[PDB]
Amino acid sequence: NELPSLCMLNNSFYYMRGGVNTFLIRVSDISVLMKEYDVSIYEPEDLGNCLNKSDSSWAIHWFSNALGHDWLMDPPMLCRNKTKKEGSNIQFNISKADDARVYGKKIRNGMRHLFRGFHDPCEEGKVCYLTINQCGDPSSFDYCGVNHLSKCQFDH
Amino acid sequence: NELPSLCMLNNSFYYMRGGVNTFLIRVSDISVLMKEYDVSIYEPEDLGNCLNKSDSSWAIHWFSNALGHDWLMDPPMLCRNKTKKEGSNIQFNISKADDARVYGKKIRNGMRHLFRGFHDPCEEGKVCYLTINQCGDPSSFDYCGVNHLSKCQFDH
Amino acid sequence: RLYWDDLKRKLSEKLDSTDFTSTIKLLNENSYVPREAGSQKDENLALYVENQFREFKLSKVWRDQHFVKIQVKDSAQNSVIIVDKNGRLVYLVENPGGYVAYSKAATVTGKLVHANFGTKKDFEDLYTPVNGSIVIVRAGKITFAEKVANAESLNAIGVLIYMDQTKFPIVNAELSFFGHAHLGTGDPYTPGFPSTQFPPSRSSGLPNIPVQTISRAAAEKLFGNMEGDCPSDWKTDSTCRMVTSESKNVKLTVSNVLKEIKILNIFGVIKGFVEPDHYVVVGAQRDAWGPGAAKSGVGTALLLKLAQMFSDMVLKDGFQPSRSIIFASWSAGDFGSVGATEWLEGYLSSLHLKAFTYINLDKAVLGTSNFKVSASPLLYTLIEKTMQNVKHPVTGQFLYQDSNWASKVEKLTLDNAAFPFLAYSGIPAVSFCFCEDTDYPYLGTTMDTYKELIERIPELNKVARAAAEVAGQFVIKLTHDVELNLDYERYNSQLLSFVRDLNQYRADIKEMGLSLQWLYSARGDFFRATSRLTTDFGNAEKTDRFVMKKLNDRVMRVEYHFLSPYVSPKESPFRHVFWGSGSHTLPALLENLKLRKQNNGAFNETLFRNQLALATWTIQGAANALSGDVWDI
Amino acid sequence: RLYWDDLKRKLSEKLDSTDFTSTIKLLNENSYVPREAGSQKDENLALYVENQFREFKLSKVWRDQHFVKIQVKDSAQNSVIIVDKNGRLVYLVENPGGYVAYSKAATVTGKLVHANFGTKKDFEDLYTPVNGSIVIVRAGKITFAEKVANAESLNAIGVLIYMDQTKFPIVNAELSFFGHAHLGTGDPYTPGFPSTQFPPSRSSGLPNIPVQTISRAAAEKLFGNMEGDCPSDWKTDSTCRMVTSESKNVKLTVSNVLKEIKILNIFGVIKGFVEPDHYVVVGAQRDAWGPGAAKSGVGTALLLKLAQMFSDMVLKDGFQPSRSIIFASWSAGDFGSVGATEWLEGYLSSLHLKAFTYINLDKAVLGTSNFKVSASPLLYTLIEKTMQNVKHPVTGQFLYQDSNWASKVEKLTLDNAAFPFLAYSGIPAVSFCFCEDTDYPYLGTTMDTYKELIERIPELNKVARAAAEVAGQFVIKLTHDVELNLDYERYNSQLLSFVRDLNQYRADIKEMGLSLQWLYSARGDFFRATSRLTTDFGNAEKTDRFVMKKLNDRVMRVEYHFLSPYVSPKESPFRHVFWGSGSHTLPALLENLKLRKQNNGAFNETLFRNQLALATWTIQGAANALSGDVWDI
């Protein structure tokens, strides 16, 4: 097995494949997690409690770093407690807004390196997020079925 | 005082004036009296019980004779009992029908002599009547008011 | 306390020496002769009846006064006129002596069409469309109110009514007559609020067309101007014809006016010795358009004599009624039991807890040949036992001659004061009479006199005497026995009969996805409820007035629990699912369902599912109301 | 027969040694813990309660079984989703642990709009049109059923409900909760006939939109995507927002399914010694969505202990209730008193002749600060005398501290099992509790546990003890005194208050040509009727059970005669013109009339004239029903 491989379908769907697992990656102005109620990830080990299998946290670990995320320095990403029935959802706050402006610049830079042709939907002064759902979880809906995922020709 | 005087308004209204009394005379296919229930006039004296005042029977007596009616020989005319609230109504059966055919011929002949321009409305095989109501009785309705009687210029 | 055998004898022997004809004659005197409701003469009689009650020394006598709107004829005459469509000249045929209360005041001109009795069937069998025409019908078979409704239902613009000589062999063909066409009882103009100001009527049951009564002579004069022979099936005069000639049509002018009147219901009461707060009510109509000897006099006479007799039996002979007996002299009966209904309406839902039976005395004597009875099934047993020991006035045989009389009993109709009691108030009621297969011809005329009455019925005194004995025995049984003589088991036959009919469509109930199972279960539950009640009565100590009170109260509520709880008494006063009127009655449910054999759109599947439901609920409710204690199921 | 003083002492001393908390704890064990109606655990508790009744040796214990359609959540999850109108990609926010019974199963997508409590006023005060939008509202103030109706009334397409932290200071923001949105009681899917086949519902009171309960966390996440600060007037969290951003709207998916269940009402009865066919009914809800310690446990515990105590007082201590006492353990209370209503519906119009009072025991213990009561005015006197000699569990002072408490009494609401008794059956009813100015936050959650309960209320045993004493004293007074402790005179104040309000429009009644005279006369007549009844009671020989029966029966019928006779119980079950729901209630008449100051077309003059009429008739009827013998007027 190599490292995780990536694919971009259109501007609304990016996907990472890590071993036998696939993840839906989206960027939009919609958030469903909050510091107050969900899990704050301060270190990579914390990712274990965001996914059905603590050991596929690896692909998200690799991806966060590939993206430019600095564990010690940057705002912790949030994630839905593995136990909830929703379930998986890792959320990066990349808003072009004051508190997260420079960090967002960076992550989007990462996205440009990872997905050639990445389209930046984030608007000045507005809120914006990067969201990852593991394919198969309810939170991935049908976004990883044949008419989407199988249409994406993977590389990397 | 002379004898009664006559006037024809149009084909629907003829009038006789006898002293201070006036009578509406009509010819049509409508009857409201029947032998079974109303008064049969076999002799002129019987007319007394057809009118409010038994003494104005005179004008109807004169008129019946003027018409050609034969008291001894002809079908008795009918009349509404003076006591009923309708009230006055003398009815001659002049139907161009078998039983009264010849008599009807005769009365109509009388009407032609009395009212120049008399129009015969009676139809072959159909029933037909000559009807007299004293002006003022309910059975004369408004037929003897200003728009009718006063429009008639009397002669005779 | 006396023995039933003694009470029977006492009643009978008091009756033997009672003079009925004198009283009927007395009520036909000029002081009372023409006594239209609210008139001074009606008020005179009201005062006389009231005085008599005071002389009889009843426990209490009182007045129940009401102000109501009736209709009387105007100083302007109603008229029936023939018009010549050629030139439109008119000929007056009659200014009727009589009129029909509650007719729309209006003038209408159209073709005239005969429709026999104006029954629903008579109209369908017509080969001449009634629409836009004035209709003429014979009196009889059904009320004026129904004739008008049926005709109005087909868009007729007016109604004439005459008495044909076949149904009314009256010599005088100029006779005029009276009636009303309100399709209900009580005051039709009852605003729930006082007013100057004028509010529309709504669900009043009032005619929207003019209706008028005419003499046979006037009808035959109309026939004189009509064509088409009448069906021999109608069995009517050869005079009769069907339609106006082409060139002619009829004009009817009715100008009746609304008048507010003061009616008096006069009441007397003999208080009960055990449960005085429960009563049997005995009533008669005191008002009449003309003399109304048979219409009003007979009844009022019986009312007076019965009141007197029972007062004497209590005071002299030791009779001690358990429950109270109320004697009621009603006014405005001629307008649709208005007096009776107004009083009933004060106690819409409470009266059935006090009055357990109403006995109507109206038109109890009309003939000699027959004895007819109409009543709640709850009184069939009382009625039967009473016929088994009352003798026919002429014949000498007991009235009871047919073991099967109960299945041939016709139901109370709207023109009977007994009707609102049963169908609106839920109080078992009974009307009865000696009569013929023929209507009493002079009813509603000026010929309804004592002299006429005593002439067609020379045994008048004896016949009135037999009428008093049945009413009297009713009243004694009802206030003497410790149980109430209301046979609640009778409604098992009724429910059986009804379901038996309904089961003739067990197929059509399939094609609609419906089960009749919950209805069968309601019927079963009612059966159980009555069976338990009979057992309870048997096991009760007849001398324990507390347990009897409890059991009797349950019996007293049977009738009322057949009033549909799912319809407003204002929209449809006659709520009794067996005996009332409307889409909530069992009969209506059947008629709607019979309209399913025709593939015509008359059937109303939705309505039926609601009817099925409401019926089931009503019947279940009654069964549950009868079962007693909530832990007994 | 014992003296009231001894019965008071006996009850109190039995109460002193009664262990309430043990029973509440026992009902919170795993055998019963999650006991949704119809579930095996509910059925377990039903069996346990039934056994306990048998051990108490009540006169008879029985089952009242019913099959009903409830709604439970599907194996498919309900979901709350945010949609990006740009590209229409969705983000799952929650799959709620809870749900709202009777929600339309549907999926709807629109804008989200906050409407505070969703009260009728809250909607009008909105500067954002709700039409075509999903609405979010806080729990409280009014039932879910009302919130849905109000919203549906403005064409909202869905409803979310959360518990804000200001009204529900619950630490766990992920807590999910349950309720129903049926705007009535009983089974909403009650076809009057059995069916495979599917018939529409009609006047069911069911939502046509999806409604769903969400955690505060999920609401705040929704607020995260909304704009506009909430009015400080709402006094809510700073988190709250008003409307979704331009680019976003919410999607709600509810997929609840209909399930038929077997519920059991468990009944025990202590038979009366004089009139056993009359009962006081004491009931409590046995079912709950979660553990429902306060929701269900307290009530059921009191039900059990009261049953035990009274059984001991009859068998050991010589207590001899005149009338029967029935103890009722209801099921499907959580769905709208369904158990209670189904039973009530077997005796639509007959129950008020047997049950003269219902005492509800639900949620009697929720706090310590206050004692609240809601009831028919017929019980205000009983309630007052009872508060005058029952002591506050913490405070030590008598509950009675405000001479004016009766004018500040709020009426029974739809979520109270006491409601259908009073407003649908016409049986006086009372609910009461110890509580705060704050709703018990854990109701309808999985946090409604004994441990939670015993923590907020460490004096639980003492407080439950005081709750039992009021219910117990009610029950003793009611079955001990020879008169019924129903204060019928109280409805004079009520009628006075109502007319007093109505008279604030004596001008507008002129401009419509209407007199209020017949209504004043009805009020006067009711006053007379009560005065006469009080006199009769005074003049009666208290030892004559026949006269008392008669007078007591009259008192027992007061309540029922305020049920409007002019509306079908199927179309509008809550017929009580004071306390029911619909256009036939006195309040409705006032509201329609208040809409006449605005020259907007909302006022309905015609409706008012009918309302005026029906009210007058209803009130007259009640006055006439109370007056007694028809010759007394």
Ligand SMILES: *[C@@H]1O[C@H](CO)[C@@H](O[C@@H]2O[C@H](CO)[C@@H](O[C@@H]3O[C@H](CO[C@H]4O[C@H](CO[C@H]5O[C@H](CO)[C@@H](O)[C@H](O)[C@@H]5O)[C@@H](O)[C@H](O[C@H]5O[C@H](CO)[C@@H](O)[C@H](O)[C@@H]5O)[C@@H]4O)[C@@H](O)[C@H](O[C@H]4O[C@H](CO)[C@@H](O)[C@H](O)[C@@H]4O)[C@@H]3O)[C@H](O)[C@H]2NC(C)=O)[C@H](O)[C@H]1NC(C)=O
């Ligand atoms: C993901 O990250 C983002 C960004 O970090 C984060 O969103 C921020 O959240 C914080 C705190 O929750 C918000 O801070 C609040 O600011 C309140 C006033 O907000 C107004 O002013 C903002 C600044 O002015 C901007 O605009 C001018 C020109 O317009 C511009 O020149 C400036 O440079 C500057 O950018 C403004 O951005 C903001 O805009 C809102 O407008 C709409 C909403 O209507 C929406 O489109 C925007 O997204 C944004 O909501 C707004 O107009 C201030 O009152 C408030 O203070 C509260 O808390 C303090 C605690 O100290 C209390 O004492 C006080 O009483 C208040 O209750 C608070 O500081 C900030 O506005 C957010 N930023 C944005 C862009 O939304 C998300 O929450 C993160 N997501 C998650 C899930 O964690």
Ligand SMILES: *[C@@H]1O[C@H](CO)[C@@H](O[C@@H]2O[C@H](CO)[C@@H](O[C@@H]3O[C@H](CO[C@H]4O[C@H](CO[C@H]5O[C@H](CO)[C@@H](O)[C@H](O)[C@@H]5O)[C@@H](O)[C@H](O[C@H]5O[C@H](CO)[C@@H](O)[C@H](O)[C@@H]5O)[C@@H]4O)[C@@H](O)[C@H](O[C@H]4O[C@H](CO)[C@@H](O)[C@H](O)[C@@H]4O)[C@@H]3O)[C@H](O)[C@H]2NC(C)=O)[C@H](O)[C@H]1NC(C)=O
């Ligand atoms: C005013 O005077 C008139 C005329 O005198 C009178 O009207 C007559 O009244 C009598 C008795 O009431 C009617 O006599 C009856 O005749 C019955 C059969 O009638 C039919 O046949 C008639 C004769 O045939 C005619 O037609 C052919 C061709 O069509 C022609 O060649 C002939 O010459 C002949 O004229 C016929 O006229 C008549 O016509 C009717 O048609 C329509 C009605 O539909 C209408 O327009 C007409 O006016 C007329 O009504 C019809 O077709 C016969 O059955 C009947 O017998 C009954 O009584 C006997 C008693 O012995 C019973 O035993 C038997 O069972 C029957 O019940 C009777 O003899 C005569 O038809 C009337 N004539 C007309 C023209 O109407 C009015 O009543 C008088 N008015 C008043 C108020 O007194």
Ligand SMILES: *[C@@H]1O[C@H](CO[C@@H]2O[C@@H](C)[C@@H](O)[C@@H](O)[C@@H]2O)[C@@H](O[C@@H]2O[C@H](CO)[C@@H](O)[C@H](O)[C@H]2NC(C)=O)[C@H](O)[C@H]1NC(C)=O
């Ligand atoms: C992830 O969730 C688990 C599950 O706990 C449930 O979900 C929580 C959000 C909250 O709803 C709890 O009430 C639920 O029990 C959490 O495990 C719990 O951890 C707490 C604190 O350490 C502990 O008291 C409980 O016993 C644990 N429950 C169980 C079933 O083990 C866990 O803490 C959550 N993880 C994170 C990082 O938030």
Ligand SMILES: *[C@@H]1O[C@H](CO[C@@H]2O[C@@H](C)[C@@H](O)[C@@H](O)[C@@H]2O)[C@@H](O[C@@H]2O[C@H](CO)[C@@H](O)[C@H](O)[C@H]2NC(C)=O)[C@H](O)[C@H]1NC(C)=O
């Ligand atoms: C004309 O009418 C008078 C009035 O009698 C009334 O009208 C009749 C049609 C009939 O309705 C009677 O019942 C009415 O009394 C008739 O006078 C009567 O004549 C009869 C017979 O001779 C006699 O018995 C009555 O006493 C009379 N009545 C009165 C009040 O005097 C009269 O006979 C009628 N004339 C004709 C020619 O028909």
Ligand SMILES: *[C@@H]1O[C@H](CO)[C@@H](O)[C@H](O)[C@H]1NC(C)=O
């Ligand atoms: C996570 O676990 C749940 C339940 O065990 C399962 O339904 C779901 O498919 C799992 N998620 C993935 C991505 O496989």
Ligand SMILES: *[C@@H]1O[C@H](CO)[C@@H](O)[C@H](O)[C@H]1NC(C)=O
């Ligand atoms: C006939 O008498 C009546 C009543 O006396 C009267 O009204 C009418 O005018 C009289 N008829 C005539 C023509 O004067």
Ligand SMILES: *[C@@H]1O[C@H](CO)[C@@H](O)[C@H](O)[C@H]1NC(C)=O
């Ligand atoms: C006869 O003449 C009068 C006067 O104009 C008129 O009113 C009436 O209609 C006429 N009648 C006929 C039938 O011509």
Ligand SMILES: *[C@@H]1O[C@H](CO)[C@@H](O)[C@H](O)[C@H]1NC(C)=O
């Ligand atoms: C009655 O109905 C028919 C069909 O609608 C119509 O043609 C006819 O004119 C009507 N008849 C009358 C007299 O109104």
Ligand SMILES: *[C@@H]1O[C@H](CO)[C@@H](O)[C@H](O)[C@H]1NC(C)=O
């Ligand atoms: C049949 O009944 C239903 C319900 O009562 C009603 O909606 C419909 O209009 C009725 N149809 C007819 C023909 O009146």
Ligand SMILES: *[C@@H]1O[C@H](CO)[C@@H](O)[C@H](O)[C@H]1NC(C)=O
């Ligand atoms: C992305 O591509 C898939 C496949 O055609 C399509 O179904 C989807 O709608 C696309 N989404 C967007 C936002 O273009």
Ligand SMILES: *[C@@H]1O[C@H](CO)[C@@H](O)[C@H](O)[C@H]1NC(C)=O
């Ligand atoms: C609500 O109503 C207004 C006016 O009828 C309409 O213009 C608007 O589109 C509606 N709003 C929605 C979201 O349906």
Ligand SMILES: *[C@@H]1O[C@H](CO)[C@@H](O)[C@H](O)[C@H]1NC(C)=O
């Ligand atoms: C007002 O009430 C009347 C009678 O109840 C009804 O006909 C009318 O439609 C109502 N108007 C409104 C606005 O609903």
Ligand SMILES: [K+]
């Ligand atoms: K006796």
Ligand SMILES: [K+]
């Ligand atoms: K006692």
